[PDB]
Amino acid sequence: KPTQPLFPLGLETSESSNIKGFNNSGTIEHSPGAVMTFPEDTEVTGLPSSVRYNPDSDEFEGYYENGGWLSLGGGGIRWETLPHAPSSNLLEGRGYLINNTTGTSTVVLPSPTRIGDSVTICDAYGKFATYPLTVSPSGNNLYGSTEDMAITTDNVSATFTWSGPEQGWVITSGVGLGQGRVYSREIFTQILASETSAVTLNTPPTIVDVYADGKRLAESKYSLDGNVITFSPSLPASTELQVIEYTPIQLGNITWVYNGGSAIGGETEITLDIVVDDVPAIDINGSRQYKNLGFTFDPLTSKITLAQELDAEDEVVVIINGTP
Amino acid sequence: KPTQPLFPLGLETSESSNIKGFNNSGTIEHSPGAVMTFPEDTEVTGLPSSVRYNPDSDEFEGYYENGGWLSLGGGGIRWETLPHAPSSNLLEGRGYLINNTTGTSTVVLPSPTRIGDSVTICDAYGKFATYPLTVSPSGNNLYGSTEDMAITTDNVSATFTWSGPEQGWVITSGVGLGQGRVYSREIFTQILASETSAVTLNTPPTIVDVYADGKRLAESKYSLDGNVITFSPSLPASTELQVIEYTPIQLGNITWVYNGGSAIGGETEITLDIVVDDVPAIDINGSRQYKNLGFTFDPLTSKITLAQELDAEDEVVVIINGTP
Amino acid sequence: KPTQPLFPLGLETSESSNIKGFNNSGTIEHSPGAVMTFPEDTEVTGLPSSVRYNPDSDEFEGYYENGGWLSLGGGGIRWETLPHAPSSNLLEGRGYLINNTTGTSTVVLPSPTRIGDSVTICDAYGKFATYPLTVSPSGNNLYGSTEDMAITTDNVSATFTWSGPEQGWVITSGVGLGQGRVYSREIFTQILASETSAVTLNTPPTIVDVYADGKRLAESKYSLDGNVITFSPSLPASTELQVIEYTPIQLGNITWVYNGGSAIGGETEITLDIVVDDVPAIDINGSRQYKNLGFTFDPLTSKITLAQELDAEDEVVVIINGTP
Numbered sequence: 001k002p003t004q005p006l007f008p009l010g011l012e013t014s015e016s017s018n019i020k021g022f023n024n025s026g027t028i029e030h031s032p033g034a035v036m037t038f039p040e041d042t043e044v045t046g047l048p049s050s051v052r053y054n055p056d057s058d059e060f061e062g063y064y065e066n067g068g069w070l071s072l073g074g075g076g077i078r079w080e081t082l083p084h085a086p087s088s089n090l091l092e093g094r095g096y097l098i099n100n101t102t103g104t105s106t107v108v109l110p111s112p113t114r115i116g117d118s119v120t121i122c123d124a125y126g127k128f129a130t131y132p133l134t135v136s137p138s139g140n141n142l143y144g145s146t147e148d149m150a151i152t153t154d155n156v157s158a159t160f161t162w163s164g165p166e167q168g169w170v171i172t173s174g175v176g177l178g179q180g181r182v183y184s185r186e187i188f189t190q191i192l193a194s195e196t197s198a199v200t201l202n203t204p205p206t207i208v209d210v211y212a213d214g215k216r217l218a219e220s221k222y223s224l225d226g227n228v229i230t231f232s233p234s235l236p237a238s239t240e241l242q243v244i245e246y247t248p249i250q251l252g253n254i255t256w257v258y259n260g261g262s263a264i265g266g267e268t269e270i271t272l273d274i275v276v277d278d279v280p281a282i283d284i285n286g287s288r289q290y291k292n293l294g295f296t297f298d299p300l301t302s303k304i305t306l307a308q309e310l311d312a313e314d315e316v317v318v319i320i321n322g323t324p
Numbered sequence: 325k326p327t328q329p330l331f332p333l334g335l336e337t338s339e340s341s342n343i344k345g346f347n348n349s350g351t352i353e354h355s356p357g358a359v360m361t362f363p364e365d366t367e368v369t370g371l372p373s374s375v376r377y378n379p380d381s382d383e384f385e386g387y388y389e390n391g392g393w394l395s396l397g398g399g400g401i402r403w404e405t406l407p408h409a410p411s412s413n414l415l416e417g418r419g420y421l422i423n424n425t426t427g428t429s430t431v432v433l434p435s436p437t438r439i440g441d442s443v444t445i446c447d448a449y450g451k452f453a454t455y456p457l458t459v460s461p462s463g464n465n466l467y468g469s470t471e472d473m474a475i476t477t478d479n480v481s482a483t484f485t486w487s488g489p490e491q492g493w494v495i496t497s498g499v500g501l502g503q504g505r506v507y508s509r510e511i512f513t514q515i516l517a518s519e520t521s522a523v524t525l526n527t528p529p530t531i532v533d534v535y536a537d538g539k540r541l542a543e544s545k546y547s548l549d550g551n552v553i554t555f556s557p558s559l560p561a562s563t564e565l566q567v568i569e570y571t572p573i574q575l576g577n578i579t580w581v582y583n584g585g586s587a588i589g590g591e592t593e594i595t596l597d598i599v600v601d602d603v604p605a606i607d608i609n610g611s612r613q614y615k616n617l618g619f620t621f622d623p624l625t626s627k628i629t630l631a632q633e634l635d636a637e638d639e640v641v642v643i644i645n646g647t648p
Numbered sequence: 649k650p651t652q653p654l655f656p657l658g659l660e661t662s663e664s665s666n667i668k669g670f671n672n673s674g675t676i677e678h679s680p681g682a683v684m685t686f687p688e689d690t691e692v693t694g695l696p697s698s699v700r701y702n703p704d705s706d707e708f709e710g711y712y713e714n715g716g717w718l719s720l721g722g723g724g725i726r727w728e729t730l731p732h733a734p735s736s737n738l739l740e741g742r743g744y745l746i747n748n749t750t751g752t753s754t755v756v757l758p759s760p761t762r763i764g765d766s767v768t769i770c771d772a773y774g775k776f777a778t779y780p781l782t783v784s785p786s787g788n789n790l791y792g793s794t795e796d797m798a799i800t801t802d803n804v805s806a807t808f809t810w811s812g813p814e815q816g817w818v819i820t821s822g823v824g825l826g827q828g829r830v831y832s833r834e835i836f837t838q839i840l841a842s843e844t845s846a847v848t849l850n851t852p853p854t855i856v857d858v859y860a861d862g863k864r865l866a867e868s869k870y871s872l873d874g875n876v877i878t879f880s881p882s883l884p885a886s887t888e889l890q891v892i893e894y895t896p897i898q899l900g901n902i903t904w905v906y907n908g909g910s911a912i913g914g915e916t917e918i919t920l921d922i923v924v925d926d927v928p929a930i931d932i933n934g935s936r937q938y939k940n941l942g943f944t945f946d947p948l949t950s951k952i953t954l955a956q957e958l959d960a961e962d963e964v965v966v967i968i969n970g971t972p
Contacts, residue, residue, distance in 0.1 A: 004339075004657040009328040010665035015652075016350055017334035017667060019341060021674020024363075026345020026664055030373075030687035038697045038710075039354035039672075049362045049377030049678075051384065053697030053710070060699065060710040060720045062362075062377070062384040062396075072384045072710075074400025074417060076722025077820075079764025079809065093722060095764065095820070097811045116403025116419065124811040124818050126791070143450070143479070153901060155791070157820045158499075161403065163421045163448040170448050172401075172419070172481045174499045175806075175822045178901035220925035220969060232926075232947050252901055253477060253502035253576055254971070255928070261941040277544035278556075280579070286935025286942075287610025290641055293585040294610075299556050317938055321544060323578070323647050323971050328663075333652040340674055341658035343665060348687075350669020354697075363678035373686045373701030375708065386686075386701070386708040386720075396708045398724025398741060440727025440743065467774070467803070482823075485727065487745045487772040494772050496725075496743070496805045498823045577801060577826035577900055601868035602880075604903070611934025614965055617909040618934075623880050645868060647902070647971050 044068060059093070077120050082107075095120035100131035103214050106148075108136040109169055112162035118172070119160050126154040130215055132181070135160070141168035143249060145182070150246075152209070152216060153178040171251065180249030181209060188229075188243035195237060198230045211242040225257070256318035263314030270304035276320045279304060283317040368392060383417070401444050406431075419444035424455035427538050430472075432460040433493055436486035442496070443484050450478040454539055456505070459484070465492035467573060469506070474570075476533070476540060477502040495575065504573030505533060512553075512567035519561060522554045535566040549581070580642035587638030594628035600644045603628060607641040692716060707741070725768050730755075743768035748779035751862050754796075756784040757817055760810035766820070767808050774802040778863055780829070783808070789816035791897060793830070798894075800857070800864060801826040819899065828897030829857060836877075836891035843885060846878045859890040873905070904966035911962030918952035924968045927952060931965040 030036065038053040038060065046063035051072070054061050061069045075093060082088060082096040087106045090096055096107065098121055109119055121133065132150040135142070142149055142160075144167045151158065156176035160169040171177065187208070188201055204227040210217040212235055223230045229243060258270055272279075279297040282289045282304065289295055296305040304318070354360065362377040362384065370387035375396070378385050385393045399417060406412060406420040411430045414420055420431065422445055433443055445457065456474040459466070466473055466484075468491045475482065480500035484493040495501065511532070512525055528551040534541040536559055547554045553567060582594055596603075603621040606613045606628065613619055620629040628642070678684065686701040686708065694711035699720070702709050709717045723741060730736060730744040735754045738744055744755065746769055757767055769781065780798040783790070790797055790808075792815045799806065804824035808817040819825065835856070836849055852875040858865040860883055871878045877891060906918055920927075927945040930937045930952065937943055944953040952966070 003660075004342075005655060005659045006662065007329060007659060007665075008662045010344070010346065010661045010663040011329045011331060011335075011659075012327075012666040013334045013668050013670075014330065014332045015334040015668060016353075017331075017670035018336040018652075019670045019672050019674070020337055020339060020658070021358075021672060021676055022337075022341035022343045022658065023677045023679055024343050024345060024682050024684070025679040026343070026682065028345055028682075028684045029347045029664075030685055031347055031349040032688075034348050034350065034352075034669075034687035035689075035695075035698055036348070036352045036687050036700070037354055037695075038699060039358035039360050040356070040697060041359075047359075047361075048379070048382070049364060049384075050359055051362060052360070055696070055713075058696070058713045060697075060712075064384075065379075065382045070402075071400065071721030073395030073397050073721050073724060074402055076397060076400050076719065076724050077764065077766075078718075078722055081763060081812065095809075097763070097818075115405060115421070116401065118401075120820070122809070122811070122818060122820055124815050126815075155818070155899060157818070159821075161419075161446070163446070164405065167448050167450075170421075170446060170479070170481070171499050172444070172446055173483075173497050173821050175819050175825055176899050176901070177499055219972065251479060251500050253500070255938075257938075257941075261938070283936050283938075284610070286932070286937060288607050288612070288641070288936070289610060290579075290581075290585070290607075290639070293581075293639060315938070315941060317936070324543065328666075331653060334668070334670065335653045335655060335659075336651075337658045338654065338656045339658040340677075341655075342660040344661050344663060345682075346661075346665035346667045348667050348669060350667070352669055353671045355671055355673040358672050358674065358676075360672070360676045361678055363682035363684050364680075365683075371683075371685075372703070372706070373688060373708075374683055375686060376684070388708075389703075389706045394726075395724065397719030397721050398726055400721060400724050439729060439745070440725065442725075485743075485770070487770070488729065491772050491774075494745075494770060494803070494805070495823050496768070496770055497807075497821050501823055575803060575824050577824070608934070612931050612936070612965070613934060614903075614905075614909070614931075614963070617905075617963060648867065 075118070090119045092117045092119060095122065097122050097124040098133055099125050100127040100133060101125045102131070104131045104134065106134040106136060108138055109140070109160060111138070112140060115162060115164055117162040120158065122157040123151070123154050128152055128156055129154040129218065132216055137169050140165060143167065143170060147182045149249060150181045150183060152181055177251040180251065181246040182249060183209070183244045183246045185245045186242060187245050188241070190241050192235060192237055192239040192241055196231060196235045196239070196241070198228050199241070201227045201229065201243065203227060205243070205245045207246065207248070209244045209246060211244065213240045254320040254322045256320055258316040258318065261315040263310045263312060263316060265312040265314070266309040268306040268309065270306065270316070270318070272302040272304070272318065275300065275302050278321040278324065279318055280322060280324065281319045285315045399442070414443045416441045416443060419446065421446050421448040422457055423449050424451040424457060425449045426455070428455045428458065430458040430460060432462055433464070433484060435462070436464060439486060439488055441486040444482065446481040447475070447478050452476055452480055453478040453542065456540055461493050464489060467491065467494060471506045473573060474505045474507060476505055501575040504575065505570040506573060507533070507568045507570045509569045510566060511569050512565070514565050516559060516561055516563040516565055520555060520559045520563070520565070522552050523565070525551045525553065525567065527551060529567070529569045531570065531572070533568045533570060535568065537564045578644040578646045580644055582640040582642065585639040587634045587636060587640060589636040589638070590633040592630040592633065594630065594640070594642070596626040596628070596642065599624065599626050602645040602648065603642055604646060604648065605643045609639045723766070738767045740765045740767060743770065745770050745772040746781055747773050748775040748781060749773045750779070752779045752782065754782040754784060756786055757788070757808060759786070760788060763810060763812055765810040768806065770805040771799070771802050776800055776804055777802040777866065780864055785817050788813060791815065791818060795830045797897060798829045798831060800829055825899040828899065829894040830897060831857070831892045831894045833893045834890060835893050836889070838889050840883060840885055840887040840889055844879060844883045844887070844889070846876050847889070849875045849877065849891065851875060853891070853893045855894065855896070857892045857894060859892065861888045902968040902970045904968055906964040906966065909963040911958045911960060911964060913960040913962070914957040916954040916957065918954065918964070918966070920950040920952070920966065923948065923950050926969040926972065927966055928970060928972065929967045933963045
């Protein structure tokens with residue numbers, strides 16, 4: 001019956017043994033000095049409770065019933081400073097303190113390998129309003145599209161999480177998040193030759209960011225009306241000016257000028273080029289008129305049905321879905 | 325004196341031994357192939373540094389001095405896709421990518437067992453504005469109440485954390501969070517028989533969500549004035565219409581019409597049904613009047629003290645605590 | 649050649665052995681009852697895959713290639729209730745459910761030791777609007793300054809993360825975050841002797857919080873115009889009143905009165921004491937005028953260039969960069 005030697009009081013050992021494994025039935029304790037290790041291993045095969053150190057990935061993984069290998073007790077963020085570079089590849093599980101004090105920069109998300117793959121960035125210096133961070137999903141999509149995205153709010157922090165290839169990276173956690181920007185086209189470029197109050201574009205744009213010598217200008221500092229950008233204050237000669245059309249991406253949770261403030265007169269219909277959500281009120285020559293009293297507005301048609309005929313040389317201003 | 329056999333150069337072993345434990349005083353190393361395991365165990369008793377694999381819970385726990393058993397190096401999020409179901413039980417420590425593309429859905433929070441028990445959800449498809457997610461604390465309260473809560477902002481992500489039974493689940497982490505809704509009553513139900521510009525309610529409601537064929541309508545598309553909801557645009561015949569009273573729950577960080585725009589005349593007192601926070605201004609027939617100049621308003625009394633007598637057939641509009 | 653005793657079928661042991669380590673080449677398994685331990689150790693020296701229990705820190709650390717010792721599978725949050733105290737030291741890696749139901753309180757961030765050191769707080773009771781939480785970076789700076797910060801939004805949750813000493817603690821994760829306050833000066837103190845509609849300050853302040861018997865008053869309840877605070881409603885005699893100047897700190901993502909509503913007449917220039925971002929419109933005696941039609945405004949100069957001479961006894965109100 002007995003398969004192997006039996007040591008009823010156990011055994012002491014005074015140098016390192018070389019043991020091909022054991023089923024243990026008692027307490028594994030340690031003494032001062034006792035160092036202890038996990039085996040190196042990069043393989044998919046495993047059994048629940050098996051634990052390892054991954055030398056490739058530098059992560060202590062255990063092998064969980066459903067989903068095999070994974071980091072021990074879920075995961076957590078590995079913070080590091082990021083040298084300001086024009087471009088930087090990030091790794092799953094890290095967090096990057098970004099310093100855009102010097103200018104804009106780009107980070108490139110890693111190839112996703114698992115649902116829940118995560119990368120955290122942070123405007124540690126509060127500089128993204130003026131020097132946006134561009135985030136690149138490489139060829140995989142971000143919010144259902146492969147378009148790069150820029151974060152133009154300073155002090156914003158954000159965890160990107162892989163939802164799978166259909167919607168791709170989505171932000172699961174963050175602070176400070178306003179409108180993401182998806183820049184479509186650099187629709188104006190110019191080394192300004194004189195002091196510049198305004199510039200005219202080749203096309204009326206939807207909505208634009210403006211960049212002076214690679215520094216994003218705040219929306220308070222310029223105004224886009226039709227196809228002219230006006231600059232308050234002006235910009236000096238020699239300035240590297242860029243205008244960039246973009247599509248907003250909403251994370252967190254409007255005035256119309258008719259005929260340059262000139263009233264055609266005896267008209268009941270105003271048509272707004274943009275289909276508008278709502279028109280609560282219209283200011284006429286410093287007098288406010290309210291919807292379903294002074295006027296009727298049809299949303300699909302974008303047509304304001306005026307109650308009475310206009311006079312000649314009146315000033316008309318429209319409020320569009322404002323602080324409802 | 326010697327208690328057991330001594331092996332001064334250690335021992336080699338060529339098959340698995342069967343060892344009832346040992347105090348180890350040297351380096352436990354491994355060779356290629358070396359697999360290593362933690363013991364299975366679901367018990368409360370433990371000693372600091374004891375480590376285990378929990379087979380019930382599928383989590384690698386260590387036993388920490390204060391609070392015994394816990395996940396190794398705190399925790400972290402276990403992401404998984406969630407099949408769109410009308411209802412779904414979630415587990416502590418998981419995160420759920422939700423797909424509400426097809427319609428609304430409900431998730432039910434687990435029984436809490438420990439302070440800091442956490443569950444993460446995510447509108448991965450940006451669909452909660454139109455197909456809200458309802459979150460259920462089962463019988464335990466959420467923000468101090470056992471009422472279910474709905475998230476109607478798309479692209480929102482949110483970690484719910486157990487604070488104990490008094491306040492219950494609270495969101496500790498998230499992105500996109502606007503107003504939670506706590507639906508009190510389905511105050512109107514109807515299969516519409518004609519095209520519908522408006523509907524009258526059995527009661528004037530405080531604030532309402534509207535649902536057409538189980539899809540939540542945006543606040544831009546309808547207006548609730550007194551006890552009539554008006555619809556811009558209209559809704560087709562056959563539509564499954566629902567109106568739902570709810571109480572907001574504020575996470576992140578207003579016009580009054582008097583006598584249907586008809587002035588009674590020679591009056592100095594306007595009373596606002598809702599007690600109002602503040603009344604900066606009143607528009608009278610397209611002329612704005614400012615508080616503590618044109619008028620005096622008392623907040624508890626909700627009474628606007630007009631400086632001069634009203635004329636007959638004037639239009640009066642009040643601004644209530646607007647963009648201060 | 650043979651260095652030590654060879655046991656070709658392994659060995660059984662019936663009591664605890666005392667082994668000075670081994671290179672293991674096979675499966676370490678366990679039986680029911682098998683308890684297993686990591687060695688205690690608080691030292692910087694280590695080799696990749698070495699694992700330990702830290703008795704000082706109560707954390708199960710592994711030794712990662714780059715950065716040696718660290719919590720196993722990154723980290724995660726250790727939630728605990730916080731006894732309401734006037735002041736409380738927090739520990740790295742914990743999260744604190746705060747109860748400010750009873751009144752304001754202060755938490756003090758720990759000495760940072762590693763980039764990514766993190767502490768989470770949470771207004772579990774939704775009480776910070778009325779009883780702000782003050783956060784102290786001790787002598788280290790927070791957002792580049794050593795000034796304490798107060799959170800006055802209820803239901804806010806927030807993780808503070810060490811970015812290194814230059815910018816110091818930054819919030820990397822959170823919910824509900826509005827304007828941080830950095831209180832500079834208690835610029836008014838008084839036990840009120842009568843019912844109080846208003847109080848006059850020794851200095852015109854920029855922006856102020858107000859506290860009645862240690863409870864922060866909501867901005868709806870009082871108004872600061874020039875150097876007079878007006879109170880709507882009033883405050884009872886015996887009230888412990890405090891006014892506090894502060895500088896906002898923006899995380900998430902305006903009316904000017906000229907000569908007390910009295911028009912000097914025949915003037916084209918209005919100068920605004922604060923340099924203003926933008927002035928879209930000016931209300932004159934209940935008539936709105938729009939920028940670049942009715943008027944021209946220069947931002948650096950803060951000068952409104954009126955088109956026509958003022959009349960005597962007119963009312964002028966200015967809109968400053970409002971809901972653009």
